[PDB]
């Protein structure tokens, strides 16, 4: 059994947005609740709402969320969250979670199964696809049979971007750093990998879903 | 609504040691109380429910205890893999009214102290296509180090005080080490007006310095 949230995006203050939680490996039935929990960047967990999974559709909410948020069971495998009146205070990763249970009739009011989250960014800024630049040692440096190369993913909004190397086949020793918000208000992220210089050309594969951007950069072993 | 006051906000302990986290409830609550482990970029993982019952696969060196208004999580035999932020959670409600829900503590960042390791440092001049955009971003990476470092940038030996961002990976699950990426952003005019670009990474009485000369790249 697993969960996956979708629908996060960049939206303007005052906007509405619907998120979706999709269950795999199970379908909803009596005995537990499905719930949403959010987390603002760098902050803690904050519960939003739950819905009975038993088919009644009964819901209950955090006091702050009443009136702006609605949780629904849209199908036997999907929960939705409709958000309205959004401000910067609602920027957060939104998680779907299934209440755990140790008996067949009801749950134990803790969350045993979680999705990876979907990010909602409430901002007046416009979408911006990143530019990707190779990272390689100075041309004048002495070559080596092993070298650390990388990619700088510069100037995007909103988060996230994803980075893989060689279509996901290169994973050992990859360091993909947390994003940083530059003074321009746009984000940047770097990723590096250490490889054997022979018979090993490395390409970073970058994706920015908010603009439907996919870009590959093959990184030459130096700035030459 | 119940408020959970979780302490400490951050704690450090050696590999093999013990960390203790306390959560105090603003009113008396039931033992429908839980603890979660969250690693950066991941969702929380349930460790304990009903105050002291271990979730499937969680070892007993995670120990939940307490009742009433004060609950405790004790993590012993600490491993580098335990580096994470931990949260308590209360379920609360009223049999009389439509009042209740879920309250989380504010979290505790746990740092696991492994062996001290000095970083190795790499510097990356801006790709040739950066300069025509009007700004360049230079990248410095400090690899595989513990404890935390301080990064200084120099341009022709002068310390930079603006245009710098730093980003640190989570602690490595095998050896507790960090990695760090530091970026210095300048206009193209600034970049082309100077020669030597230096990243200095300091760890107490140790410094590791890496430079490049623009004319050589």
């Amino acid at each position: 059994q697993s969960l996956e949230e979708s629908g996060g995006d960049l939206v303007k203050p005052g906007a509405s947005l619907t998120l979706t939680c999709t269950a795999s490996g199970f379908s909803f039935s009596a005995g537990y609740d499905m719930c949403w929990v959010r987390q603002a960047p760098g902050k803690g967990l904050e519960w939003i709402a739950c819905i009975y999974a038993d088919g009644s559709g009964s819901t209950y909410y955090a006091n702050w969320a009443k009136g702006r948020f609605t949780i629904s069971l849209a199908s036997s495998t999907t929960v939705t969250l409709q958000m309205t009146g959004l401000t910067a205070a609602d920027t957060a990763t939104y998680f779907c979670a299934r209440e755990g249970a140790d008996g067949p009739d009801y749950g134990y009011a803790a969350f045993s199964l979680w999705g990876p989250g979907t990010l909602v960014t409430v901002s007046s800024g416009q979408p911006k696809a990143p530019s990707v630049f190779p990272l390689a040692p100075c041309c004048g440096d002495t070559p080596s049979s092993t070298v650390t190369l990388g990619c700088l993913v510069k100037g995007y909004l909103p988060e996230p971007v994803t980075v893989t190397w060689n279509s996901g086949t290169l994973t050992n020793g990859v360091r993909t750093f947390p994003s940083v918000r530059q003074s321009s208000g746009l984000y940047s992220l770097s990723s590096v990998v250490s490889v054997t210089s022979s018979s090993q050309p490395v390409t970073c594969n970058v994706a920015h879903p908010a603009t439907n951007t996919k870009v590959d950069k093959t990184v030459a072993p130096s700035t030459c | 609504d119940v408020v959970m006051t979780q302490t400490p906000a951050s704690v450090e302990a050696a590999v093999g040691g013990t960390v203790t986290i306390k959560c105090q409830a603003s009113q008396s609550i039931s033992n429908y109380f839980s603890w979660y482990q969250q690693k950066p970029g991941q969702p929380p993982k349930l460790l304990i429910y009903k105050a002291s019952t271990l979730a499937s696969g969680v070892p007993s060196r995670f120990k939940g205890s307490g009742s009433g208004t004060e609950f405790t999580l004790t993590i012993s035999d600490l491993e580098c893999a335990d580096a994470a932020t931990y949260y308590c959670q209360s379920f609360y409600g009223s049999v009389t009214s439509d009042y209740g829900g879920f309250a989380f503590g504010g979290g505790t960042e746990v740092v696991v102290k492994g062996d001290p390791v000095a970083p190795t440092v790499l510097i990356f001049p801006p790709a040739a296509d950066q300069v025509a955009t009007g700004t360049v971003t230079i990248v410095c990476v400090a690899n595989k180090y513990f404890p935390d470092v301080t990064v200084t940038w120099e341009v022709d030996g002068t310390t930079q005080t603006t245009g710098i961002e730093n980003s640190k990976t989570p602690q490595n699950s095998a050896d507790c080490t960090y990695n760090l990426s530091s970026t210095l952003t300048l206009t193209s005019t600034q970049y082309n007006s100077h020669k030597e670009y230096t990243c200095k990474v300091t760890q107490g009485t140790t410094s590791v310095v890496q430079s490049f000369n623009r004319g050589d790249c």
Binding site: - | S30, G93, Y99, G100, G101
Partner: peptide, 9 residues
């Protein structure tokens, strides 16, 4: 929430 409270508490 009241029903859940009745059941658990």
């Amino acid at each position: 929430i009241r029903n859940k409270s009745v059941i658990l508490l």
